[PDB]
């Protein structure tokens, strides 16, 4: 495991400078650079922060060599590029990071779209957060085999969500899809969520939801649907207005009608005699 002795030795050969700050260590790569390629913040047996300043994926060869961080709970990556068509776990293995349960990936310099391969060997994760100001495509197989995942956060200006995104994922307790550009929610997306307690869909472009979309959320406790331009015309808002009125205790904040500004829960649609779902 990385400690005092490893930090002192790193400052001797001067490939990367190391300085112990508080109960943590700061690694600058390359040494004495005004704008370093890598700035690592390591707290042994707790967390690792990787601050990147890369122009292209080949800059990863400038990472500290033979570094053995060991077991940590959280890995935070900031401004880092997706390592081409190579898993993110390969960066983690090279730095000697062992079995992290939380991965945070935040970057405006991705260099490419995220794939299923980028998450290979990260099946053990319990918490995953992907953040970017860049418009990104979410493939249908992105979260396949992420069976230990209980907390998912995607803030990547996503417009569409694939229908089979949560296929075979059953341990999910929290889904944070707020502050994206979502115009639609596909029917059957929350069909197999027996443990889901929190769902955030606030600050998107949702005008409607398919009928029966939340009916299988048996463990649901909190839901965010505000800051969406909801179409409160009848019968379009019939299902959501009735559902929000019945589950009023679960709603966090207030979903409002694009026109009037009235809460969605206050709409009572008349009966025309048509078929319901
Ligand atoms: C990111 O993806 C954009 C859209 O990709 C399209 O959709 C996928 C499902 C495939 O069919 C692919 O062949 C299509 O191109 C691209 O337009 C965009 O260039 C990609 N971004 C980068 C940086 O490569
Ligand atoms: C990243 O490096 C460039 C020079 O390549 C520099 O202009 C920029 O300020 C650096 N970013 C930070 C956060 O220091």
């Amino acid at each position: 495991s990385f400690g005092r002795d490893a930090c002192s030795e790193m400052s001797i050969d001067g490939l990367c400078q190391c300085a112990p700050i508080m109960s943590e260590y700061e690694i600058i790569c390359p040494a004495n650079a005004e704008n370093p390629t890598f700035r690592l913040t390591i707290q042994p047996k707790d967390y690792v922060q990787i601050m990147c300043n890369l122009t292209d994926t080949t800059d990863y060869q400038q990472l500290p060599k033979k570094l053995r961080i060991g077991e940590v709970d959280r890995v935070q990556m900031r401004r880092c590029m997706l390592p081409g068509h190579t898993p993110i776990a390969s960066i983690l293995d090279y730095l000697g990071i062992v079995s992290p349960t939380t991965l945070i990936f935040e970057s405006d310099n991705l260099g490419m779209n995220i794939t299923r391969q980028h998450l290979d060997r990260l099946h053990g994760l319990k918490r995953f957060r992907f953040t970017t100001r860049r418009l990104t495509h979410i493939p249908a197989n992105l979260l396949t085999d992420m069976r230990n995942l209980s907390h998912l956060e995607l803030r990547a200006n996503i417009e569409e969500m694939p229908s089979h995104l949560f296929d075979d994922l059953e341990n999910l307790e929290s889904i944070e899809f707020g502050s994206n550009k979502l115009r639609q929610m596909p029917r059957g997306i929350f069909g197999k969520m027996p443990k889901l307690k929190q769902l955030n869909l606030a600050s998107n472009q949702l005008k409607s939801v398919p009928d029966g979309i939340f009916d299988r959320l048996t463990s649901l406790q909190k839901i965010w649907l505000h800051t969406n331009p909801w179409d409160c015309s009848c019968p379009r808002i019939d299902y959501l207005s009735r559902w929000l009125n019945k589950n009023s205790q679960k709603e966090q904040g207030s979903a409002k009608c694009s026109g009037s500004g009235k809460p969605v829960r206050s709409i009572i649609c008349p009966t025309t005699g048509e078929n319901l779902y």
Side-chain angles (χ1 to χ4, degrees), residues 158-252:
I158 307 149
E159 285 173 51
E160 301 281 65
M161 281 291 180
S163 306
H164 288 159
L165 183 61
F166 311 105
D167 261 29
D168 306 305
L169 281 95
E170 282 160 85
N171 286 329
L172 268 156
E173 287 161 60
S174 179
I175 291 171
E176 299 273 329
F177 284 157
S179 301
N180 281 289
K181 284 197 269 84
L182 287 168
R183 301 166 299 194
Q184 279 187 106
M185 285 307 289
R187 183 184 186 247
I189 190 77
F190 307 125
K192 212 178 184 184
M193 306 277 184
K195 288 171 90 182
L196 198 73
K197 294 172 182 180
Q198 282 180 40
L199 178 61
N200 196 314
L201 294 169
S203 297
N204 283 290
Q205 290 302 317
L206 295 160
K207 284 174 173 68
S208 67
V209 288
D211 297 354
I213 193 79
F214 307 128
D215 290 357
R216 284 177 176 198
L217 303 181
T218 53
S219 284
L220 195 70
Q221 287 158 26
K222 286 188 176 184
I223 191 153
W224 289 259
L225 287 164
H226 62 84
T227 325
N228 280 293
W230 299 108
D231 176 6
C232 284
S233 61
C234 290
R236 202 186 189 176
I237 205 71
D238 192 34
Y239 167 78
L240 186 65
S241 57
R242 285 177 81 90
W243 189 89
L244 283 174
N245 202 252
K246 195 198 174 186
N247 301 271
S248 52
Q249 69 285 349
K250 295 174 188 185
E251 207 198 349
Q252 313 299 124

Side-chain angles (χ1 to χ4, degrees), residues 85-119 121-133:
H85 294 285
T86 306
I88 296 160
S90 295
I91 297 161
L92 265 50
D93 295 325
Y94 191 76
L95 292 168
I97 295 154
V98 183
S99 297
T101 47
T102 303
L103 177 69
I104 298 156
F105 203 99
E106 191 186 310
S107 178
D108 280 6
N109 183 33
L110 297 169
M112 68 193 286
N113 288 300
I114 192 159
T115 65
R116 174 193 181 167
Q117 196 188 358
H118 291 134
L119 290 174
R121 306 195 298 271
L122 289 171
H123 51 274
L125 283 176
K126 281 174 173 70
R127 205 174 295 261
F128 174 63
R129 178 162 83 89
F130 180 76
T131 311
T132 185
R133 279 182 274 265

Side-chain angles (χ1 to χ4, degrees), residues 18 26-27 32 38 57 71 73 87 110 115 128 136 139 151-152 204 210 223 228 233 255 263:
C18 183
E26 186 188 45
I27 292 172
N32 308 297
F38 301 102
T57 59
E71 231 163 80
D73 299 303
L110 297 169
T115 65
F128 174 63
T136 60
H151 299 75
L152 176 80
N204 283 290
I223 191 153
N228 280 293
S233 61

